[PDB]
Structure formats: structure tokens, C-alpha cells
Amino acid sequence: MMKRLVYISKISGHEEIQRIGKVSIKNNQRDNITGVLLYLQGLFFQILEGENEKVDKLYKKILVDDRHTNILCLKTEYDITDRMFPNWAMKTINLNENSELMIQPIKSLLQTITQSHRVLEKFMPARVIYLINQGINPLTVEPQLVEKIIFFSDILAFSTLTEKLPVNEVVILVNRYFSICTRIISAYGGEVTKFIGDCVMASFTKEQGDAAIRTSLDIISELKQLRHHVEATNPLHLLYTGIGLSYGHVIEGAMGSSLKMDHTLLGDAVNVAARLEALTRQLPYALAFTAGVKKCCQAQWTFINLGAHQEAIEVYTVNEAQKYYDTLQITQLIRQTLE
């Protein structure tokens, strides 16, 4: 039983690589692993093949290696019938250091496609990248009914802010907001589906109840630090958020046609979380979630019941989500500052 994987990576910092192939040779030679490692203008390409399990450890050892970064496994071939390089413990080819005409073609293509690839990667849904990082083709996965926590957040009084900031300040502000949201959601095990306007869409599993709530609090908290970090001429000092969470059945998977695919979550919980985010504009709290979310949590939160809003939904929060301000006073305090 043998398997084969392939990945691409980026070097972590700046002919320093002659000796690292002069480590791979020895330890692959010991587990009957073969494979190739290419190098071209800041980028790494490796193929690894051997019996399914001792292949898997070194790849974990490679994952945590200080000198490359941004690792993504493209293909996995399970129970391969025979090897692609039966004689190569680890063949190392520095494609930068070849000056023959006949190879410059393929060398330039390989460079252009993978640089393109790396840009496209940044626009993928987290979940599609994750599937590719196992050996699963996202255009062949059947979508599945699953129980998820759905997350939405967007910028408060953002219509006021688009009306009275120049375009280039708006973009600086929205990028900052997206990068803080994405960093914290990811750190806690969740996945960003997409951005919809100033809106961040994300989801967590039913086991990540407390992490979805911690995520929400850490985002609210980081905006608070940021607001007093900057000067009053910086649009960042007027940046506030509201967050809605919900929990339910959703159908998750890749959908559409061969003109266009997207990663999509179908089911009513998606709409519910969006309306709780909207609702926070009229509550003295910045986070609102359903009862189903409350029941997914193991930590000992102080829950606060906010009655039924709309068929009805019971709405809840935690008191650490309490505001130190009044929402109307700030949405018109944003208007006054902006003149």
C-alpha cells in the first residue's frame, strides 16, 4: 500500500538550498520513498511517494519547516500501483540554474501558470482550498447536509461612511476590517465563505460554539483597541461592527455550472444570522445569536435573553458583548465627525 502527493510552497526568506537536498537524499533512502523537488524563482515544487503512512510523517515534518511557507498540496494519489521515479531518493533540480534554450520554454510556462495559480488561491473559499489540500476534487464532491454555526458581521453606519469618505479611505478601512476578521475567524478554526459588500460571511462546526463566540468578542475588542490607537483624522477611529450567529441544517458544497461555480451554504439559518446582525443596531449589545448557538457552548457564559424577534426566534447574547455607547448617538456621532 503506497501513496503519492504533490505540493507547491513559497520560500520563507532568501544557492542556500544545495544542502537541504543534501538532507532529503539520506532519510528518504531509508523508508523507500522516491520523489522530485524543483526550485524556480522563489517557489518550491515537490513530489513524494512511498507506502501510505511513513509518507505522511515527513510531510508533517515538512509542513512545520522554518524555511518555506504558504504550503498547499494540489494532488493526492492513494494506493498508487507503481512509482513515478523508481530510482530517485530525492532528485533536486534548481530550474533557475539551467541556461539551455530548449528548456526555457517550459520553464517560463511553469513560472507563469503557478504565479497565476498563487493569485487565484487567495480568492478561493477556505473550504475549497481545504478540500484541494486533501486529495479531493471540489468539482466532484457531492454537497452534504450538515449542522453548522453561521456567522455574519458588517460595519455600522457604513452608508454614512461611504457617503462622506473619499473612495481611497473607504478601501483602506474596509481592507483593515476584512483582515482582522479573517485572521481571528481562522485562528479559531472557522472558515470564511465570502465577502458580500462590507459583510463577512463565515461558519463553524457544532463543536465550535464557544470559539464562534470568542471570535466575535475578539473582533469587537480589536476594533476598540484600534479606534484609540489612531488619530482623529484617520477613518479607522470610527469603525464599529455588529455580529449575528445562527445554528441549523445547511447544504454545503460547490454548486453552479461550468460557466461559473461557487461554494455555497443553503438553508434558512443563513438568512437568520443576517437578520440577527441587523438586529444588533437596536440592542445595547454588539453580538446576537439564536438559542441553538447557546446550546452548542460548553463554557460558562453569562447568557442574556433578548426575547423573541422575527415565525419567532428567541434571541440571546453574553454580557461581555455589552456596549459602552448608544448606537444612535454614535451613528450620528460618525456623521458629525465627518465634516
**Cα(150)–Cα(296) distance, rounded to whole angstroms?**
12
Residue 4: CB minimum distance to ligand FMN, A: 13
Which residue's CB is nearer to ligand FMN, number 49 or number 252?
Answer: 49
Binding mask 35-54 for ligand FMN (x = CB under 6 A): --x------x-x--------
Residue 182 or 303 having the CB closest to a second copy: 182
| Number of residues written out for the chain | 339
54 in Cβ contact with 61 (< 8 Å): no
Alpha-carbon distance 157 to 283, whole Å? 15
Can you tell me the distance from the alpha carbon of 287 to that of 213, in angstroms, rounded to the nearest whole number?
A: 9
Asked if residue 55 lies in contact with residue 33, where contact means CB atoms within 8 angstroms, the answer is: yes
Reduced to 3 states (helix: H, G, I; strand: E, B; else coil), residue 323 is coil
Cell numbers standing for residue 269: 439559518
Please, which residue, 178 or 301, has the CB nearer to a second copy? 178
Shortest gap between Cβ of 44 and ligand FMN (angstroms)? 4
Shortest CB 335 distance to a second copy, Å? 14
| 109 binds ligand FMN per the rule CB under 6 A | no
- Which one of 65, 163, 268, 326 is in contact with ligand FMN (CB under 6 A)? 65
Report the nearest approach of a second copy to the CB of residue 264 (Å): 5
- What 8-state DSSP symbol labels residue 13? -
Q: How many CA atoms lie within 13 A of 319 on its CB side?
A: 5
DSSP letter (8 states) at residue 67? T
Contact region with ligand FMN (CB under 6 A), list: 61-69, 73-81, 172-180, 186-194: 61-69
Nearest to 153 by CA among 317, 337, 287: 287
**Size of site (CB under 8 A) for a second copy:** 84
Q: Is 21 in the site for a second copy (CB under 8 A)?
A: no
First-to-last CA distance in the chain?
70
User: What are the CA-CA distances from residue 86 to residues 48, 49, 50 (Å)?
Assistant: 12, 10, 10
Query: Interacting stretch for a second copy, rule CB under 8 A, among 17-25, 87-95, 302-310, 314-322?
Result: 87-95
* DSSP category for residue 285: B
27 binds, among a second copy, ligand FMN, none (CB under 5 to 8 A by kind): ligand FMN
Q: How far apart are CA 3 and CA 81, in angstroms?
A: 9
User: Considering only 20-28, 131-139, 146-154, 318-326, which stretch makes contact with ligand FMN by CB under 6 A?
Assistant: 20-28
Residue 220 grid cell: 469587537
Determine if 307 is a binding residue for a second copy (CB under 8 A).
no
What are the E-state strand segments in the chain?
2-11, 34-40, 43-51, 68-77, 91-94, 144-155, 191-196, 199-205, 241-256, 261-266, 287-290, 303-309, 313-318
68 binds ligand FMN (CB under 6 A): yes
Which residue type is seen at 17? I
Residue 226 binding target from ligand FMN, a second copy, none, CB below 5 to 8 Å by type: none
Q: Cα separations (Å) of 200 from 182, 191, 196, 318?
A: 8, 11, 6, 21
Is residue 105 near a second copy by the rule CB under 8 A? yes
| 67 contributes a contact to a second copy by CB under 8 A | no
Size, binding site for ligand FMN by CB under 6 A: 16
Residue 131 interacts with a second copy (CB under 8 A): yes or no: no
Q: Least separation, in Å, of the C-beta of 240 and ligand FMN?
A: 43
- Site residues for a second copy, 137-176, by CB under 8 A, read 137-139, 142-145, 158-159, 162, 167-168, 170-171, 174-175
**Strand, coil or helix: 45:** strand
Q: Is 238 in the site for a second copy (CB under 8 A)?
A: no
Q: Is 19 in the site for a second copy (CB under 8 A)?
A: no
Instruction: Give contact residues for ligand FMN (rule: CB under 6 A).
Output: 9, 20, 23-24, 27-28, 37, 44, 46, 58, 61-62, 65, 67-68, 90
